[PDB]
Amino acid sequence: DNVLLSGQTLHADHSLQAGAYTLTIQNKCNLVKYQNGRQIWASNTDRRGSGCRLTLLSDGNLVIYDHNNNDVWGSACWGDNGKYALVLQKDGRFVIYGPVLWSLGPNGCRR
C-alpha cells in the first residue's frame, strides 16, 4: 500500500500509507501528506481541477491528473524511459526510484 510502479495510479482520494505517513491525492487535486492525520505537506493545487488522480510516468515523472487528463502538477523530473517506483517511506519522504536496475531472468540487469 505504499508503492506505486510506473504506469500505475492512485485514484481520487486514494492514498499511499507507510507507517504514519499518508500521501493522498485528493479528489479536488491537492496531493497531501499527513503524519498521523495532521497535514504536513501538499502540492498546493487544491481546486486546480477535479476527479484528480496521481500517476507515475514511465520516465519516472510524477504527475497529478485532472479527470480531463490535464496535467495539474508534476515532479518535473524525468530520467531514462524505463520503469520506476515511487515509494512512500516510513519516514515521510516519498521517493521515486530511478529506472529499473535488476531483476531475475535473461537480461534483467541494466548495469
Partner 1 sequence: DSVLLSGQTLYAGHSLTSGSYTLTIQNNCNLVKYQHGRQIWASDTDGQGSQCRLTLRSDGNLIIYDDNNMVVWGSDCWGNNGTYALVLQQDGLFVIYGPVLWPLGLNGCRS
Rounded to the nearest angstrom, the gap between the alpha carbon of residue 106 and the centroid of all alpha carbons in its chain is: 29
Contact residue for partner 1 among 13, 67, 77, 81 (CB under 8 A): 77
C-alpha cell at 96: 521515486
Contact 42, 32 (CB under 8 A): yes
Positions in 34-73 near partner 1 (CB under 8 A): 60, 62
Contact residue for partner 1 among 46, 48, 58, 97 (CB under 8 A): 97
Pick 29 or 62: Cβ nearer partner 1 = 62
- Interaction of residue 94 with partner 1, rule CB under 8 A: yes
Do you know the residue count of the chain? 111
Pick 51 or 98: Cβ nearer partner 1 = 98
Using CA atoms, how far apart are residues 58 and 1, in angstroms rounded to an integer? Answer: 20
